[PDB]
Design a binder for this molecule. Structure first.
Ligand SMILES: CC(=O)Nc1ccc(-c2csc(N)n2)cc1
Length: 191
Protein backbone atom coordinates (compact mmCIF):
# COMPACT_ATOMS: atom_id res chain seq x y z
CA UNK A 1 0.00 0.00 0.00
CA UNK A 2 1.50 3.36 -1.10
CA UNK A 3 0.38 6.09 1.33
CA UNK A 4 -0.34 8.78 -1.21
CA UNK A 5 -1.79 9.73 -4.56
CA UNK A 6 -0.01 8.76 -7.79
CA UNK A 7 -0.60 9.53 -11.45
CA UNK A 8 -0.94 7.08 -14.34
CA UNK A 9 -1.25 7.62 -18.08
CA UNK A 10 -3.32 5.22 -20.15
CA UNK A 11 -3.45 4.47 -23.86
CA UNK A 12 -6.45 2.72 -25.42
CA UNK A 13 -5.42 -0.52 -27.16
CA UNK A 14 -6.08 -1.32 -30.83
CA UNK A 15 -9.67 -2.06 -29.85
CA UNK A 16 -10.30 1.22 -27.96
CA UNK A 17 -10.10 -0.66 -24.64
CA UNK A 18 -8.33 0.12 -21.39
CA UNK A 19 -9.29 -3.21 -19.77
CA UNK A 20 -10.85 -1.65 -16.73
CA UNK A 21 -14.14 -1.79 -14.82
CA UNK A 22 -14.94 0.77 -12.07
CA UNK A 23 -17.51 0.79 -9.18
CA UNK A 24 -19.12 3.63 -7.15
CA UNK A 25 -18.30 3.13 -3.46
CA UNK A 26 -19.01 5.72 -0.74
CA UNK A 27 -19.11 8.47 -3.42
CA UNK A 28 -15.62 7.52 -4.57
CA UNK A 29 -14.93 5.57 -7.77
CA UNK A 30 -13.04 2.33 -7.35
CA UNK A 31 -11.54 -0.43 -9.50
CA UNK A 32 -13.82 -3.45 -9.60
CA UNK A 33 -12.03 -5.30 -12.39
CA UNK A 34 -8.76 -5.23 -14.28
CA UNK A 35 -8.38 -7.31 -17.44
CA UNK A 36 -5.12 -9.21 -18.08
CA UNK A 37 -3.05 -7.90 -21.00
CA UNK A 38 -4.59 -4.45 -20.97
CA UNK A 39 -3.37 -0.85 -20.71
CA UNK A 40 -4.68 -0.78 -17.12
CA UNK A 41 -2.74 -3.91 -16.20
CA UNK A 42 0.38 -2.42 -17.82
CA UNK A 43 0.18 0.87 -15.99
CA UNK A 44 -0.28 -1.12 -12.83
CA UNK A 45 -3.86 -0.37 -11.79
CA UNK A 46 -4.96 -2.80 -9.13
CA UNK A 47 -8.20 -4.13 -7.70
CA UNK A 48 -9.60 -1.75 -5.12
CA UNK A 49 -7.68 1.30 -6.34
CA UNK A 50 -9.42 4.66 -6.02
CA UNK A 51 -9.63 6.86 -9.07
CA UNK A 52 -9.56 10.43 -7.73
CA UNK A 53 -9.43 11.98 -11.20
CA UNK A 54 -9.61 11.26 -14.92
CA UNK A 55 -8.08 14.02 -17.07
CA UNK A 56 -8.09 16.48 -14.15
CA UNK A 57 -11.89 16.35 -13.73
CA UNK A 58 -12.86 14.98 -10.27
CA UNK A 59 -14.59 11.60 -9.83
CA UNK A 60 -16.53 12.53 -6.66
CA UNK A 61 -20.08 11.25 -6.45
CA UNK A 62 -19.92 9.81 -9.98
CA UNK A 63 -21.87 6.75 -11.08
CA UNK A 64 -20.09 3.67 -12.41
CA UNK A 65 -21.87 4.26 -15.72
CA UNK A 66 -20.71 7.89 -15.90
CA UNK A 67 -17.08 6.94 -15.26
CA UNK A 68 -17.30 4.37 -18.07
CA UNK A 69 -19.01 7.05 -20.19
CA UNK A 70 -16.10 9.45 -19.56
CA UNK A 71 -13.40 6.91 -20.44
CA UNK A 72 -15.19 6.30 -23.76
CA UNK A 73 -15.76 9.92 -24.88
CA UNK A 74 -12.09 10.78 -24.13
CA UNK A 75 -9.35 11.04 -26.82
CA UNK A 76 -7.42 7.93 -26.01
CA UNK A 77 -3.83 8.81 -26.98
CA UNK A 78 -3.35 9.87 -23.34
CA UNK A 79 -5.73 9.38 -20.41
CA UNK A 80 -4.41 10.65 -17.10
CA UNK A 81 -5.89 9.15 -13.94
CA UNK A 82 -5.12 10.06 -10.32
CA UNK A 83 -5.07 7.05 -8.08
CA UNK A 84 -5.04 6.46 -4.31
CA UNK A 85 -3.39 3.08 -3.75
CA UNK A 86 -5.82 0.36 -2.60
CA UNK A 87 -7.33 2.48 0.28
CA UNK A 88 -9.65 -0.21 1.66
CA UNK A 89 -6.86 -2.75 1.87
CA UNK A 90 -3.94 -3.46 4.15
CA UNK A 91 -1.07 -5.92 3.87
CA UNK A 92 0.02 -8.46 6.46
CA UNK A 93 3.36 -10.26 6.42
CA UNK A 94 3.57 -13.78 7.83
CA UNK A 95 6.24 -16.46 8.23
CA UNK A 96 5.33 -20.10 7.68
CA UNK A 97 5.74 -22.58 10.52
CA UNK A 98 8.17 -25.45 9.68
CA UNK A 99 4.92 -27.30 8.85
CA UNK A 100 4.40 -24.64 6.11
CA UNK A 101 1.37 -22.81 7.59
CA UNK A 102 0.85 -19.08 8.23
CA UNK A 103 -1.97 -20.32 10.34
CA UNK A 104 -5.51 -19.39 9.26
CA UNK A 105 -8.66 -20.86 7.69
CA UNK A 106 -10.57 -19.22 4.87
CA UNK A 107 -13.51 -20.21 2.65
CA UNK A 108 -14.61 -18.44 -0.57
CA UNK A 109 -11.48 -16.32 -0.16
CA UNK A 110 -12.76 -14.94 3.17
CA UNK A 111 -10.58 -15.68 6.22
CA UNK A 112 -12.82 -17.47 8.72
CA UNK A 113 -10.48 -18.41 11.54
CA UNK A 114 -7.07 -17.69 13.09
CA UNK A 115 -4.96 -20.38 14.78
CA UNK A 116 -3.10 -20.07 18.10
CA UNK A 117 0.66 -19.51 18.18
CA UNK A 118 0.46 -18.82 14.41
CA UNK A 119 2.27 -16.14 12.51
CA UNK A 120 -1.18 -15.02 11.41
CA UNK A 121 -2.18 -14.67 15.05
CA UNK A 122 1.05 -12.85 15.97
CA UNK A 123 0.54 -10.47 13.03
CA UNK A 124 -3.04 -9.71 13.94
CA UNK A 125 -4.68 -11.23 10.92
CA UNK A 126 -8.45 -10.70 11.05
CA UNK A 127 -11.46 -12.77 9.95
CA UNK A 128 -14.37 -11.48 7.91
CA UNK A 129 -11.62 -10.29 5.54
CA UNK A 130 -11.53 -11.20 1.84
CA UNK A 131 -8.14 -12.16 0.41
CA UNK A 132 -7.38 -9.79 -2.47
CA UNK A 133 -3.70 -10.37 -3.28
CA UNK A 134 -0.91 -12.70 -2.26
CA UNK A 135 2.68 -11.62 -2.86
CA UNK A 136 1.40 -8.93 -5.22
CA UNK A 137 -0.78 -11.32 -7.26
CA UNK A 138 -4.53 -10.72 -7.48
CA UNK A 139 -6.26 -14.01 -6.45
CA UNK A 140 -9.88 -12.87 -6.59
CA UNK A 141 -12.16 -15.45 -8.22
CA UNK A 142 -9.53 -18.21 -8.01
CA UNK A 143 -10.99 -21.22 -6.27
CA UNK A 144 -10.03 -21.76 -2.67
CA UNK A 145 -7.99 -24.73 -3.88
CA UNK A 146 -5.91 -22.54 -6.20
CA UNK A 147 -5.40 -19.85 -3.53
CA UNK A 148 -4.33 -22.67 -1.22
CA UNK A 149 -1.71 -23.72 -3.81
CA UNK A 150 -0.42 -20.15 -4.23
CA UNK A 151 0.25 -20.04 -0.51
CA UNK A 152 1.87 -23.46 -0.83
CA UNK A 153 4.09 -22.40 -3.75
CA UNK A 154 5.21 -19.19 -2.03
CA UNK A 155 8.38 -18.89 0.00
CA UNK A 156 8.71 -18.86 3.77
CA UNK A 157 7.54 -15.23 3.74
CA UNK A 158 3.99 -14.54 2.63
CA UNK A 159 2.25 -11.26 2.00
CA UNK A 160 -1.51 -10.94 1.91
CA UNK A 161 -3.59 -8.00 0.87
CA UNK A 162 -7.00 -8.18 2.59
CA UNK A 163 -10.24 -6.14 2.39
CA UNK A 164 -13.03 -6.08 5.05
CA UNK A 165 -15.60 -8.53 3.69
CA UNK A 166 -18.46 -6.05 4.03
CA UNK A 167 -16.48 -3.87 1.59
CA UNK A 168 -15.28 -6.66 -0.68
CA UNK A 169 -18.89 -7.87 -1.14
CA UNK A 170 -20.04 -4.35 -1.88
CA UNK A 171 -17.31 -3.96 -4.50
CA UNK A 172 -17.59 -7.31 -6.35
CA UNK A 173 -21.32 -7.03 -7.15
CA UNK A 174 -22.72 -6.75 -10.70
CA UNK A 175 -20.32 -9.62 -11.49
CA UNK A 176 -20.44 -13.44 -11.26
CA UNK A 177 -17.72 -15.16 -9.08
CA UNK A 178 -16.11 -17.42 -11.73
CA UNK A 179 -16.35 -14.58 -14.24
CA UNK A 180 -13.87 -12.95 -11.86
CA UNK A 181 -11.90 -16.21 -12.12
CA UNK A 182 -11.60 -15.44 -15.87
CA UNK A 183 -11.61 -11.69 -16.37
CA UNK A 184 -9.59 -10.48 -13.35
CA UNK A 185 -5.88 -10.16 -14.03
CA UNK A 186 -4.21 -12.81 -11.87
CA UNK A 187 -0.70 -12.43 -13.24
CA UNK A 188 2.54 -11.64 -11.47
CA UNK A 189 3.50 -8.06 -12.64
CA UNK A 190 5.70 -7.37 -15.68
CA UNK A 191 8.95 -5.36 -15.36
C1 LIG B 1 -15.07 1.23 -19.59
C2 LIG B 1 -16.15 0.17 -19.38
O1 LIG B 1 -17.20 0.28 -19.94
N1 LIG B 1 -15.78 -0.92 -18.47
C3 LIG B 1 -16.62 -2.07 -18.10
C4 LIG B 1 -18.02 -2.11 -18.14
C5 LIG B 1 -18.68 -3.29 -17.73
C6 LIG B 1 -17.93 -4.41 -17.35
C7 LIG B 1 -18.56 -5.71 -16.90
C8 LIG B 1 -19.83 -5.75 -16.27
S1 LIG B 1 -20.15 -7.26 -15.86
C9 LIG B 1 -18.81 -8.00 -16.44
N2 LIG B 1 -18.58 -9.41 -16.35
N3 LIG B 1 -17.95 -7.06 -16.99
C10 LIG B 1 -16.55 -4.35 -17.33
C11 LIG B 1 -15.92 -3.19 -17.71
Amino acid sequence: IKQGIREVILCKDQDGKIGLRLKSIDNGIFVQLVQANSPASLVGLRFGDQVLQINGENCAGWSSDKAHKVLKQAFGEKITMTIRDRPFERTITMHKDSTGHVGFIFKNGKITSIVKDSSAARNGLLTEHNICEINGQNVIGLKDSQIADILSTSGTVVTITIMPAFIFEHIIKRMAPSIMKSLMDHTIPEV
